[model samples]
Target: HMEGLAGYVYKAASEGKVLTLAALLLNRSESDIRYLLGYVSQQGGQRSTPLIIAARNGHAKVVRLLLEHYRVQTQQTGTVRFDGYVIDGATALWCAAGAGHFEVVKLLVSHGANVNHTTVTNSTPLRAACFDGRLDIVKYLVENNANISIANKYDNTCLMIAAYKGHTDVVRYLLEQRADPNAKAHCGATALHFAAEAGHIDIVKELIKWRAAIVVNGHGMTPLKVAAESCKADVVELLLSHADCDRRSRIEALELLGASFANDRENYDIIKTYHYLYLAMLERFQDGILEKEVLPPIHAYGNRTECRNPQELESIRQDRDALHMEGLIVRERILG
Candidate 1:
């Protein structure tokens, strides 16, 4: 039906008359020719129906002619359900996704095709490409910043589709660009849970490396628990190692510290009142020094004048004067 219609449409093109054939498809008044060309325009090509052909095809001139004349809604949605899937809500974007036509897809997208818009049957362009394993088309969509996070009616995101279908590279690429791996589906199962249950080790590892939070499903089963029950050794090891892994003492030490501070008398008194209590308590309870040098001096002071050396006394005086000049002057302690 499509090929015969395409031929007539092309034949009409010879005389710069494109509507002669499109007028047949729609049983409209003579004026309906313009209406047919203007609304829901289709391309004439051998490989596809006018409506199904990629806009990138050179043979889409018939379509362009219709578009130039009709101003047809390029984003017209299909309403009929086919193969248990409804096409009624599908726009030109839906068509582009199925064909994996990169340029055509780009054109449709640039022309304001809703990249993230969901079709009537609750299908998205990304889901279409993902299910078909069209990695390049998927890459193109992703590269163009398609919302990979959008979920279908079933709550399945593009990441879930890629993971379930074992598109390892696609999943990896999506993760590299910060796709959510722990996104829960409608059933409350995350991509990690699904991949782990399915024995998808690589996907599971990627999810963990990105710090995918392991949440439990309604069944009270976490990804690790699922992996454990499923006996997935590698998956179990990866998740358990993370769950059970303890940071080395270095990382722990970096988080907390125990050291002494040297500060002014006021600060020292405050530290003595607050921080020193714990130290004093430890000293009293534990086997340690109770009290010997409560206020120990950092350096011992001696009389340089008793050395009977004039040069030494002069040097000490110069050092004291320099400290005094720097506002660090202090009185000499006398041992009586």
Candidate 2:
């Protein structure tokens, strides 16, 4: 009959009653304890062992005791529950790692738990550790040879998940471990895309420093496009500033020029390259808009050619617009 320690192990483990669990295990034979450990939550229900409950609860002491029993009594060598828990479909090691039980993780690994063990959806311990910002557990898992690049069922690598959650430290460590910053998932989105969309400007900058592909066309979305759609102004601004020097910087300068022009959409001439675009657009804005530079009088003195009349302002606008249009044309040509 389902009574005594058999009925109590799951509850005791859930509550982290290590003393009671210990006392129960002390008097029972190995076979008896093992049988009690198999008790289900309800009759005909799936069985969840004591270690699974303890590991899920971050009860390292209780977990250690259960591990000892499973080894000495059940004579089991690897994980006692390789088939996974009935509730979450995660193995004991996965449960401990997901719960951030660092001690439990170490204990499980020492007992031959697979460092790379996956959940039902293929999420690894390293991935779970990254998910929760468990830096210590992540280090232990990585040092123990956890595959950082393995994509889960969502096709997300550790880097993508960390960046998505704005875990900059985790993202940085994963990058240092040579995790692919450009790894694609969930319709070809990269880590940069996730960071940008989440308004993680610092992480976006880090990904850029690591040379993450900024304008990836895999799923027809770039980090810039993602940041813009999410209305992350700082992220968009940083992306635009970086684009200032990128191959497309000239095009960005052109677009800025168009926005800078007061009204005219065409009919002025200026250099259209990256440097020239920056000089005209950025430098002129700083001087003209920011510094509020005054133009020379409309009626020029003998050698004075400077002018700031409505006519002169119109000329400036046309010039800036022309530069912007040329940049747009250059970009269009490349795309076409």
Candidate 3:
């Protein structure tokens, strides 16, 4: 790859080596020499998958030949998975966009490949294009009506992906295309949340300028909250200064921040216990168990065939007292 492998492949193709390439493709598709020559087209395990290898070489003709001549479908349903993963589901357009090959990207798009086909992981070609800061490719895809709101497995939109990955121009292009900065994923996370969490200040400003809705109720983490937790100070400050910033959670954020402020015997000993309890509460929060009910007293049961005896109010009262003595608080905390 030193002199750039694609140059070598082009030279070989010009020297009537395409026949040798065809033989290598049929017999030993994973050979580096064949890959260097741009003739391998195999998937699964040792093979780099035709699209992946084509991308690495940046051979516009070989890439086009693979798609048009061999008729390599970039759609996920192709044979034994690309990247050893059980799916090549990312259409060839996505592959080209990800590799930042403008000519190959146009070729695939012209052939009617889905410019916006999301992978099994929910990553779209637009996201890949934006992440790589390939503005022309992104512009083409956007003009073709790509779904910019699409989120990945973690529920991150293309804007968030670009912002978090620190691709400034890509973020700008996406915003110009009217991508929603406020669009929340399944977890209610907006692009701003990602920008702050990853400590990308320019992206934070870009999202703010677009007037991204900073807070949505019931979302586990706000941008500033995540920023503070990840110890990204500049992001924390920028988020805090925004006009749409929430004031209510500052105390809670400070509480998490304060946990690190104390190193005394009392604080250190108690923090671990509190941390464990906090984690357990988070687990319960995920299950919607944080919103539960304490009901009327149940009757006591004796032998199998015996009728149950109703418990007295006095006994329920005593049980409640016992629970209170055990540091348990039977109180309701409304969330979202």
Candidate 4:
């Protein structure tokens, strides 16, 4: 076990002792120093090398000292996975960026660490930085010519993560840097869809301002649909208000939103909220162009039709329960 010196380095008090040790270590033969310096250790959060340990802990002076050693490795990777954080095979720079150590990242990149260096899942340091909202590190990485458009194994771009995580400044910066807002992830979701689903109103606004397309994901869920299904009321209204959303899209968005609120989450007071939206949909869709609308044959047990008559609409609106059953039926029909 290399725990003796590795342990001190892991908890090394200050740059003073580190430098003191550096001079003392140089007193030994270079091969003896390699045994102490370059040895990899494993533990919780898994350490792969001295460079990784120094970088992970934000020890800039220690990082430079380790780099000065002939045997140290920068890109050596390991199972450094942390919760939704670092993944397996993370490099020194990846861990540095993953933990939000800006100087370590700047140091590594300037020291010729491959900014585009990827892990086992094909995630780069930029993705790591974005995951944790490390905006400073993100800028440095991008400034060093890190691939702005490169995606992870999941096909998640930097913009998508920044949007999903509700990093307003990061999202805005990425967009100003000309990140593709409409870029789809592995699941066909754009930054708009993620922002919508997460109910990040300002982020959704930024993406819309940047012209993120109002589109559906691979699962046929648009940003409007996901926002509604997630009970994000404000996001739904914002999406419906966008200029690119046409009347028919508006009608469908509101109707489906009404249906989703109707069946899902079981909020008694909120279910009645759909009545107004359904009325809006009807007013927009019909606009007095037709004398009357056709109705689907109503089944007592499985009525999937929208109410065209005031009597029927009033009945559902009054009971909220009928609105519930009606919402369940319509959404099932549409999704089916």
Candidate 5:
């Protein structure tokens, strides 16, 4: 009877027949039913249980049926390994959260699922959801008592993962839920660090509005330094405009940009444009135009190719002017 029931349940669950699958489990022990529902082997030999399969496929009805029938054991203590294609050590909740199945996530959470359940490497369901940019799942997890402060194996929280992936909505939601905007990863990098490094101007703005720390010590580099080293001009400008930014940081940021272009000389026009900006910003560290000369220009301003896109190219020109003006004013004050 058990052998026949297992075969039937596996087939019915795979096909997503909730009623048919549920009826066959009648008069069965919860343990036996859960064991059979644990996983189905595919022809290719990959293994994932009915619940995990259902959740990942967004089959909310079948998931509900499985949960209703079983006693609903939410937390799996030992390391739960699945096929390589699927994330190992992931539970049904993790699978659902990762795939952005909001309804399935909601169903599992309401039915005593471990909202903070972790994989073998300490990756929480919340981290999985945030990494995938699932704003709905991220919010649901937070509201359902998921620990916002928890970090994964790499010491990354949902906020950090969201920012790293450039998910503005998820980052914003995590911030609104009172996630630690300054939470640091294993290397002491905060959400702002990853946001700036990714060249996400809007997300950086949101994180700044939430009062994320400007200067974090991530492996001896500040957030501004990371942005500069990564050649994120918009991000570099944004950081420079903040009240706490200093002249020294600005100079270093420009220096980093010059070094980056020097190393990768492929984009001739782009490199030339950056060279001019670099010279413009360097004026802050020197005297008047006649007396100012730091690094020689990589290409004379007139010799470079005209940028293909006027709007974008002109925006960069405007930025160069802005930096020059800001630097000139500062130099005037100091030399006066």
Candidate 6:
């Protein structure tokens, strides 16, 4: 009665046929159901039980049948591959969460599945759900005490990945859970830094709201510095408007943003903004007051020398090249 039994279960589960699956498994030998049905070789010789396959496909009834009747374990490990997702050692709950099979995920978790079960590289079911913004699965796992801060070999956490992917809902939920925005990857990058480079202003705002401090990465990439350097004009503006931003830092941001757009993309608006900020810098640091922002005769940009003092800066006033050079000088000085 058990000959080629694994194939029958696999076919029924993959096709979402709960009636056929249970009908076939009825009056079957319990010994083989525990062993043969647990791991059937599938595509590319990868082994995954029927429960895991049905979970990935969101075939809830088949999964339910496998769970109750066959008593197939939810945490069976195998080399599982389903469409875009491929994992070396994955379980039913991990596949369900990763593929956004919410019903399957809840069923597996509620049936005593280990939500925190980790596979290759220490990936929790919760971490798997974050890639595609599986908000429902994330909530279920978190409510079940899933590992929120568990990191992979790369030291990347659930919140870090969600923020990087621009999942606004997931990011907010993670922040609400108090996921550490300051948690750094092995590369010395925090969740805020990832959001900065990826240009997710809303996520950046949430991070800031949750007390994400502007911090430097292992490579000295601060949130502001990365924003300006990566040509994220909006993010640079957002940070500039922050109330706690220091005058010097604000000045440097404007200068760097101008330099970035000037040298990289050459946006006329940014170039003009840089010029205005240049005058502002002089107003503060010239050690004197100019009742009006003295407009330099506008000069087109060209390769030229940079100035260190207000008097020397005036000579470059009309010249964009001079402004760029000055930006370079100031940025270098700041870095130094």
Ranking by TM-score: 4, 6, 5, 2, 3, 1
Count of residue pairs whose backbone atoms collide, per candidate: 6, 0, 1, 0, 2, 2
| Tens-digit per-residue lDDT, 1-336, candidate 6 | 554677877888878988988787767577766765675667565667787778878999988888776677776886677565567778888888888988888898878899888889788889888877889889888999997988877899999888889998999998898788889888888888888778899998999889887677888767887776666778877876775345556655665665665445435454564564565456457554333322232253234344445566566657555565555544454453
Could you tell me the TM-score of candidate 6? 0.79
Model 2, position 160, has a per-residue lDDT of 86
Candidate 2 TM-score, C-alpha based: 0.67
Cα lDDT of model 3 by residue, 1-336, tens digit:
423444444344333354533443453343454344333334223234444455434556666665654555555222223243453455556666776889878777776677667677887888878777788988888888888887788777888778878887888888988887777767677778778778889988888888778665246777766765555657765765654323245433433332321223323322332332243234334432432232223242111111011122123324433322111121111111
lDDT of 4 by residue, 55-170 (tens): 87788877877676644667677556567454677788998898898888888877778899888888888998888898898888889888878888888998998888999999
Q: Stretches of candidate 6 above 4 Å error?
A: 1-5, 82-85, 243-248, 262-285, 288-336
Per-model TM values vs. the true structure: 0.54, 0.67, 0.58, 0.84, 0.74, 0.79
lDDT of 1 at 200: 84
Give the lowest summed-lDDT range of ten residues in model 1: 252-261
List model 2 lDDT by residue over 1-336, tens digit each. Answer: 647557677778778999988887777776787677655454244445677767767888888887775562221212323224343446677767767888988988887777777666788878888888888999899988999977799788889888988888888899899998778786778888889779898899889889888556366657765664454646766787765354344333343333223113332224323333344344445333422233333332222332223334345435444444444343332232
Screening candidate 1 with a backbone cut-off below 3 angstroms (N, C-alpha, C), the clashing residue pairs are 38-70, 38-72, 43-50, 78-87, 78-88, 79-88
lDDT of each: 0.52, 0.64, 0.56, 0.73, 0.68, 0.74
Model 5 TM? 0.74
For this target, which candidate reaches the highest TM-score against the unseen true structure?
4
Estimate the Cα RMSD of every predicted model relative to the unseen true structure.
Answer: 21.8, 11.9, 12.7, 3.7, 8.3, 5.5
Q: How big is the positional error of residue 282 in model 6, measured in Å on the Cα after superposition?
A: 4.9
User: Roughly what TM-score does model 3 have, to 2 decimal places?
Assistant: 0.58
User: Cα lDDT for residue 141, model 2?
Assistant: 93
Native RMSD of candidate 6 (Å) = 5.5
lDDT of 1 at 268: 28
Worst 10 residues of 4 by lDDT: 8-17
